[PDB]
Symmetry: C3
Subunit: 330 residues, 3 copies
């Protein structure tokens, strides 16, 4: 049957087109792929002055709110903190969140099994005028985090500038690339701000813009903490010039339920010696967690992948022809 | 032969069964896979008081034994330390491990090529009553780690509480999930402890339980340090409801031979100014290294993967039928 | 035809040889593969004395130039720094890089939008004898990083010793391995330096040797900063003894163009209290960024991968025979 022959030829044409069109070109089979080695470097430029009630103005610079000062892909930017100054080790009252005692007989000498705040001496001392707490041994100024200021202390950190330095290199092809490209020059970085469409190559990122691109409001993240995920893509083709290789930045919002465990927070201390006595300052920092992940793939022409793809295409064409013959045979 | 025909049918059915079940149901081939972006948040709530000989009691709160206070997937929990207080720079004796001198002629001015402890002045000073060491320019109180206390100083860190907050999101499906599943509530986290069977969803992990589940003893590990690997896997099917997404916590023991380089240790210093002189406190912290790695995949029904799997199954079926025909013809 | 059959037999033999020769053995199709759980531990040794102009000799031990003292795969080794001591908050002049004012009317009260150094009070004060800068509210001693010393301060860090402790464990096969192997003993670690050919198993890496193996000169990296990428490979076969499993170290140079943002640098501060006044020391550290990434694969004999590879080879052989028959047909 002439019609049957035409159908067989048509099937052959479709599969032949598919192997050259998709496997060879869309999937870039003629090229080999390998991994890269990336190093993330971050730098902040911003200053926020927070005036605490009953205390002098406090100046914070890049070294203050950037706790990973050495440089890492995962860093926290301080936006709100609770300061407990002049802490000293001694016998004093604990926080009321642990327990409330009405007499000395209720207190038990020892340490709490869960959420321990210190070594209980065994006496009930008044925490304030109304309630009384157990007497413990340790830092007497307790971190009273029951009251969180609604206005963010470091609210100026919204429209600051963030610089990300990423250098990637493919060991198979021995090609090294950096986030700074030929289009980006010295004068450009002096005034550019990163944008999704306008300035995709500007390495100066705005914290508020980064938070808004992920889908989160900066006010709540500055108040109670947050997590922002940043991803850098390096998919490119090595057949063209290295100028075409440009990184693509994507921002993802990592958030959960607001009722249980809202935001991100931690604690750190600064130990010092004043008047011959060891003292420290404890801070409950509510900062935004920034995570940077780099992943990319590069392809360059090679003969062995091309031959393997040609063989696979010939095999698929043969299998398709045999299946078409079996179907036409019925 | 009727029997030969039956054999052909039997092979044909079994290959069809394999494509129908293993390829689909088991492998979720009709479902696409994509990576996730994860951010690890850790918080400790424990207190240990160490009372060394010759010094007052020292209280170590969360800000003390957690050196990565900012928060990272890789953190060290202090369990044992060697304190060398009131260090000041000057010309004084070195450690006996560097070298032993019997006269001033044996000492050579300069710096040691390997394991240098300071700049030698060229004089031999007595380290103690018996032996003499080279005079170097550096911190006079030399950390002598020859004696390691068998009882762990921060031995209370065994049954403390560790909270791990992990937020994962898939960019392909735009679905965000957190380790705090809907089954876990606020009252549940107040008194729950993680267990493989009892409480698999409780985000509160006990350090001693984590060490026991890794095939290690907490005492011998904390005596000299160690490394514990924690892996969180997110294997869920997006075809069902989002409540089915439940993280899996697995603990792996990363240990080596104890005869060569036992445990894990490091050194850090706290710089301060006392009486107009710059001093510091050096600690050789023997702590357990905790590494948290998150890796998971998601699967949702899609048309293109389903069509590709159907085509591959049809091709495999045709190839199997042709091979059976060729074998039966011989 | 005889020659046609001879050519056919030859081709079928060649494909059969290929499947057993390459897919089965070269590719180790029979074995199953899985990932590992790695944990990098680093420890530095060495001392550098930087005698600054008009200041006493400063001793820098391991805890000083190693900012990630707790231990991490990504760490920075200090090689050059700019010290700005005795910083205190107050009203004073700013850096000339922010702006130059000739009168008090030019200054505007508030904070700079980009590269902010403090809160301007609206007054123009002379920074030095020649030029005048805006008056800000913050740390009065400004980090004047216009002059970078050409000789590296911590130039002794070139030929120091770096020890890397890596423990990997395959969860599928329950096999734990460490960078220390049976060939490496206690006496060997006392005196050895890592080499590409001589000492591939010595865990003591020289910083200068690591920098030179990556293709970068250590002098420029100590002067203005640099990034060095280290990779550890754990490809091995579990069919043999565990002694054959040996790590392979590869060093990669991560660098960019020298005109725009050359090297790596950061800033950190050490807070202290002297004479009842809060002070700090700011340092602009020019250090080399070391990134350690571990990846490996282990294979062990299994029956299911062997059967799948045999089936795939039989299918490929059948497809090749069918294609040969079709070619011989016409
Ligand atoms: N977070 C940031 N915001 C704005 N500009 C930045 C930021 N980080 C770096 N830059 C600019 O990029 C240029 C090149 O970066 P480089 O690593 O040389 O910084 P630097 O000059 O060492 O730092 P500094 O400008 O504080 O002296 C610098 O002129 C710097 O001003
Ligand atoms: N290591 C831990 N052990 C036990 N419980 C913890 C731990 N970390 C956090 N939690 C509890 O989980 C709940 C949610 O965590 P969240 O991040 O809100 O801490 P928080 O309430 O801000 O800290 P705090 O309880 O010190 O005020 C809190 O009630 C907290 O007490
Ligand atoms: N950077 C380094 N260069 C050379 N040798 C090192 C280095 N770090 C550690 N080592 C050696 O490796 C051996 C085992 O390491 P381990 O973790 O036991 O150190 P340690 O003995 O606790 O510390 P230290 O050697 O400072 O007393 C030690 O004998 C140590 O001297
Ligand atoms: C005392 O502290 C408790 C702690 O919860 C608080 O409820 C109470 O209002 C405090 N009383 C005064 C007078 O501050
Ligand atoms: C937003 O950016 C502008 C810069 O034009 C700045 O003046 C302003 O303070 C920023 N907003 C906040 C809340 O910091
Ligand atoms: C600086 O870079 C920008 C990139 O947007 C480019 O448009 C501009 O021409 C560059 N300047 C010079 C002087 O090359
Ligand atoms: C002196 O120090 C050396 C150092 O190893 C030690 O062996 C010796 O016992 C010490 N002597 C006394 C009396 O402490
Ligand atoms: C074990 O946990 C209990 C809590 O029930 C605690 O009292 C005890 O101190 C813990 N053990 C150690 C060695 O800390
Ligand atoms: C709290 O969570 C637990 C999970 O084990 C659940 O059994 C319990 O019902 C929850 N409590 C409430 C009040 O929902
Ligand atoms: C004053 O500071 C400016 C800042 O750039 C500098 O150019 C100038 O040389 C300085 N003058 C003196 C006398 O140091
Ligand atoms: C190179 O190593 C030698 C050790 O033999 C050391 O003396 C020398 O100071 C090192 N060079 C530098 C520049 O530190
Ligand atoms: C120490 O290890 C080295 C490895 O190069 C080996 O040659 C030497 O024999 C070992 N020493 C002892 C005492 O086994
Ligand atoms: Ca750190
Ligand atoms: Ca001090
Ligand atoms: Ca890290
Ligand atoms: Mg609280
Ligand atoms: Mg020692
Ligand atoms: Mg500058």
């Amino acid at each position: 049957n002439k019609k049957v022959g035409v159908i067989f030829r048509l099937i052959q044409l479709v599969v032949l087109v598919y192997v050259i069109g998709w496997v060879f070109v869309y999937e870039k089979g003629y090229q080999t792929s390998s991994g890269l080695i990336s190093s993330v470097s971050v730098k902040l430029k911003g200053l926020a002055v927070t005036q605490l009630q009953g205390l002098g103005p406090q100046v914070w610079d890049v070294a203050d709110y950037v706790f990973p000062a050495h440089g890492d892909s995962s860093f926290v930017v301080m936006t709100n903190f609770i300061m407990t100054p002049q802490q000293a080790q001694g016998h004093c009252a604990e926080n009321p969140e642990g327990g409330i005692c009405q007499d000395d007989s209720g207190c038990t000498p020892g340490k709490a099994e869960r959420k321990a705040q210190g070594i209980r001496t065994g006496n009930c001392v008044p925490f304030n005028g109304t309630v009384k707490t157990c007497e413990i041994f340790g830092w007497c100024p307790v971190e009273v985090d029951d009251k969180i200021p609604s206005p963010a202390l470091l609210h100026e950190a919204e429209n600051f500038t963030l610089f990300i330095k990423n250098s990637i290199s493919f060991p198979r092809f021995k090609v090294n690339r950096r986030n700074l490209v030929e289009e980006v020059n010295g004068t450009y970085m002096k005034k550019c701000l990163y944008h999704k469409i306008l300035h995709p190559l500007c390495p100066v990122f705005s914290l508020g813009y980064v938070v808004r691109e992920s889908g989160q409001d900066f006010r709540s993240l500055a108040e109670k903490g947050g997590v922002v995920g940043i991803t850098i893509d390096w998919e490119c083709d090595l057949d063209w010039h290295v100028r075409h290789c440009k990184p693509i930045y994507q921002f993802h919002g990592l958030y959960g339920e607001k009722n249980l465990s809202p935001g991100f927070n931690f604690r750190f201390a600064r130990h010092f010696v004043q008047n011959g006595t060891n003292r420290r300052h404890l801070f409950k920092v509510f900062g935004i967690r920034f995570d940077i992940l780099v992943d990319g793939k590069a392809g360059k022409f090679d003969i062995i992948p091309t031959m393997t793809t040609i063989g696979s295409g010939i095999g698929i064409f043969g299998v398709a022809t045999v299946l078409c013959d079996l179907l036409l045979l019925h």
